Design an enzyme around this catalytic site. Structure first.
Site, PDB file in Angstrom:
ATOM      1  N   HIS A   1      32.778  63.272  24.673  1.00 41.48           N
ATOM      2  CA  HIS A   1      32.168  61.959  24.468  1.00 41.48           C
ATOM      3  C   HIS A   1      31.086  61.630  25.511  1.00 41.48           C
ATOM      4  CE1 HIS A   1      34.760  61.014  21.184  1.00 41.48           C
ATOM      5  NE2 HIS A   1      35.855  60.880  21.903  1.00 41.48           N
TER       6      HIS A   1
ATOM      7  N   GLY B   1      34.746  57.087  26.400  1.00 41.45           N
ATOM      8  CA  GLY B   1      35.945  57.600  25.717  1.00 41.45           C
ATOM      9  C   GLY B   1      36.780  58.513  26.599  1.00 41.45           C
TER      10      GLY B   1
ATOM     11  N   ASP C   1      38.521  68.213  17.285  1.00 45.66           N
ATOM     12  CA  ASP C   1      39.186  66.991  17.791  1.00 45.66           C
ATOM     13  C   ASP C   1      39.304  65.928  16.691  1.00 45.66           C
ATOM     14  OD1 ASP C   1      39.611  65.840  20.937  1.00 45.66           O
ATOM     15  OD2 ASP C   1      39.111  64.255  19.479  1.00 45.66           O
TER      16      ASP C   1
ATOM     17  N   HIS D   1      38.410  62.987  17.016  1.00 49.57           N
ATOM     18  CA  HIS D   1      37.256  62.097  17.220  1.00 49.57           C
ATOM     19  C   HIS D   1      35.928  62.824  17.057  1.00 49.57           C
ATOM     20  CE1 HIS D   1      40.566  59.977  19.410  1.00 49.57           C
ATOM     21  NE2 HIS D   1      39.973  58.906  18.913  1.00 49.57           N
TER      22      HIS D   1
ATOM     23  N   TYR E   1      47.801  63.552  22.861  1.00 48.65           N
ATOM     24  CA  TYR E   1      48.542  62.506  23.533  1.00 48.65           C
ATOM     25  C   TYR E   1      50.058  62.549  23.304  1.00 48.65           C
ATOM     26  CZ  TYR E   1      43.672  61.278  23.952  1.00 48.65           C
ATOM     27  OH  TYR E   1      42.314  61.360  24.202  1.00 48.65           O
TER      28      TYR E   1
ATOM     29  N   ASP F   1      44.869  65.936  19.175  1.00 50.86           N
ATOM     30  CA  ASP F   1      45.197  64.616  18.629  1.00 50.86           C
ATOM     31  C   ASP F   1      45.081  64.524  17.104  1.00 50.86           C
ATOM     32  OD1 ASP F   1      42.416  64.854  18.797  1.00 50.86           O
ATOM     33  OD2 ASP F   1      42.175  63.125  20.141  1.00 50.86           O
TER      34      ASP F   1
HETATM   35  C1  LIG Z   1      42.849  45.521  20.934  1.00 46.20           C
HETATM   36  N1  LIG Z   1      42.087  46.168  22.016  1.00 46.20           N
HETATM   37  C2  LIG Z   1      41.794  45.318  23.162  1.00 46.20           C
HETATM   38  C3  LIG Z   1      41.599  47.534  21.867  1.00 46.20           C
HETATM   39  C4  LIG Z   1      41.388  48.067  20.501  1.00 46.20           C
HETATM   40  C5  LIG Z   1      40.943  49.403  20.308  1.00 46.20           C
HETATM   41  C6  LIG Z   1      40.652  50.287  21.421  1.00 46.20           C
HETATM   42  C7  LIG Z   1      40.188  51.727  21.131  1.00 46.20           C
HETATM   43  O1  LIG Z   1      40.385  52.122  20.230  1.00 46.20           O
HETATM   44  N2  LIG Z   1      39.528  52.415  22.104  1.00 46.20           N
HETATM   45  C8  LIG Z   1      39.025  53.803  22.091  1.00 46.20           C
HETATM   46  C9  LIG Z   1      39.889  54.790  22.905  1.00 46.20           C
HETATM   47  C10 LIG Z   1      39.167  56.122  23.156  1.00 46.20           C
HETATM   48  C11 LIG Z   1      39.418  57.139  22.065  1.00 46.20           C
HETATM   49  C12 LIG Z   1      38.773  58.489  22.357  1.00 46.20           C
HETATM   50  C13 LIG Z   1      39.808  59.396  23.014  1.00 46.20           C
HETATM   51  C14 LIG Z   1      39.848  60.808  22.422  1.00 46.20           C
HETATM   52  O2  LIG Z   1      40.928  61.289  22.120  1.00 46.20           O
HETATM   53  N3  LIG Z   1      38.722  61.479  22.202  1.00 46.20           N
HETATM   54  O3  LIG Z   1      38.734  62.615  21.727  1.00 46.20           O
HETATM   55  C15 LIG Z   1      40.855  49.790  22.772  1.00 46.20           C
HETATM   56  C16 LIG Z   1      41.317  48.427  22.987  1.00 46.20           C
HETATM   57  K   LIG Z   2      35.823  66.353  15.928  1.00 44.28           K
HETATM   58 MN   LIG Z   3      40.207  62.805  20.477  1.00 48.91          MN
END
Ligand SMILES: CN(C)c1ccc(C(=O)NCCCCCCC(=O)NO)cc1
Ligand SMILES: [K+]
Ligand SMILES: [Mn+2]
Ligand SMILES: [K+]
Length: 355
Positions: A120, A128, A155, A157, A283, A244
């Site tokens: 990211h 991210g 991934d 994402h 995770y 993930d």
């Molecule tokens: C209700 N609230 C305050 C929230 C709602 C959604 C998120 C979120 O999704 N954030 C994104 C998390 C990063 C995901 C990327 C990690 C990954 O596995 N990349 O490959 C955060 C807070």
């Molecule tokens: K991907």
């Molecule tokens: Mn991911």
């Protein structure tokens, strides 16, 4: 020659510190070791990336700030500036670079850094949970030897940071399969996203819905990489294998098992190109180790015992203590018509890619 396995005690301790995946790196390595797979690989100590190495992509201003806040640019909710994050970043950057260097010297045809895959990060902003784009750094290194690099990102994402880095060039094609849904991070990578400028058609994205399982996922991935290999004729591959997607992950999106991902990896491996292997998300820490251990066996052509061997984190694998992961009963929300529509869009796009 044998696959390179990027590892050292110091490197694992550093990666273990990452707040989002505490002790994951130790879980992965020790399971690999418990299956004795490290005896069939060549262990290479990673080097720590220097400032100038990191600056081959990241801006000097970003890096100096990263260093500063580390002592006491996107560094908010998802990327909080905690102590030592600069050094953790340099370690993982340096590990992926080292894997790229091993491949350049024909030391190996496969080099593994399970702790990389920070897809990211942008040139001047963390994103991210990613504070440095090691995959970009490794691709740039591979570019010294290999004229065209294919980056495949499995991934959950969208591999936005790597796509963005190479969005304007035809020397690197990026292919990401990912969940694409309103509200779902990072929000980019619809099938209409094909890159920009001289790089038009040299990004591929497969937007996928919740609930996909091994058979349909492999059908998609095979259909895409076959067309991509035929059109693009890559000379080297960087493959991000974020776990993930695996049934049982807190992301609760896809319904994959390591077998399905393994078929995607096998397909790539048959090309017999220099291939740099990365981790990513993941995770459910024990399932992530189960996955990458299984994938490490796939790489070595070894079939592993179903029974998890006794080792440090044995208790993490209860109550059943087996290597296989059972799909959940969550619905597959992927309509066959939509998937066919997506694949046909990509088939079309790739006709422009002519080497
Ligand atoms: C209700 N609230 C305050 C929230 C709602 C959604 C998120 C979120 O999704 N954030 C994104 C998390 C990063 C995901 C990327 C990690 C990954 O596995 N990349 O490959 C955060 C807070
Ligand atoms: K991907
Ligand atoms: Mn991911
Ligand atoms: K590109």
């Amino acid at each position: 020659l044998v696959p390179v396995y990027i590892y050292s005690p110091e490197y694992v301790s550093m990666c273990d510190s990452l707040a989002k995946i505490p002790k994951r790196a130790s879980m992965v390595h020790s399971l690999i070791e418990a299956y004795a797979l490290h005896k069939q690989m060549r262990i290479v100590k990673p080097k720590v990336a220097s400032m100038e190495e990191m600056a081959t992509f990241h801006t000097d201003a970003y890096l100096q700030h990263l260093q500063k806040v580390s002592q006491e640019y996107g560094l908010g909710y998802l990327c909080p500036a905690t102590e030592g994050i600069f050094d953790y970043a340099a370690a993982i950057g340096g590990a992926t670079i080292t894997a790229a260097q091993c491949l350049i010297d024909g030391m190996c045809k496969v080099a593994i850094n399970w702790s990389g895959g920070w897809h990211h990060a942008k040139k001047d902003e963390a994103s991210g949970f990613c504070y440095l784009n090691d995959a970009v750094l490794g691709i740039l290194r591979l570019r010294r030897k290999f004229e065209r690099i294919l980056y495949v990102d499995l991934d959950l994402h969208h591999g936005d940071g790597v796509e963005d880095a190479f969005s304007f060039t035809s020397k690197v094609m990026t292919v990401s399969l990912h969940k694409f849904s309103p509200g779902f991070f990072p929000g980019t990578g619809d099938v209409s996203d094909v890159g920009l400028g001289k790089g038009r058609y040299y990004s591929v994205n497969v937007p996928i819905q919740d609930g996909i399982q091994d058979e349909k996922y492999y059908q998609i991935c095979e259909s895409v990489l076959k067309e991509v290999y035929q059109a693009f004729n890559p000379k080297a591959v960087v493959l991000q294998l974020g776990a993930d997607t695996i049934a049982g992950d807190p992301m609760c999106s896809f319904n994959m098992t390591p077998v399905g991902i393994g078929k995607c990896l096998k397909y790539i491996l048959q090309w017999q190109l220099a291939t740099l292997i990365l981790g990513g998300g993941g995770y459910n820490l024990a399932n992530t180790a189960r996955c990458w251990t299984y994938l490490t066996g796939v790489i070595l052509g070894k079939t592993l015992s179903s029974e998890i061997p006794d080792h440090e984190f044995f208790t993490a694998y209860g109550p059943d203590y087996v290597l296989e992961i059972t799909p959940s009963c969550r619905p597959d929300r992927n309509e066959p018509h939509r998937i066919q529509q997506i694949l046909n869009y990509i088939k079309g796009n790739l006709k422009h890619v002519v080497i």
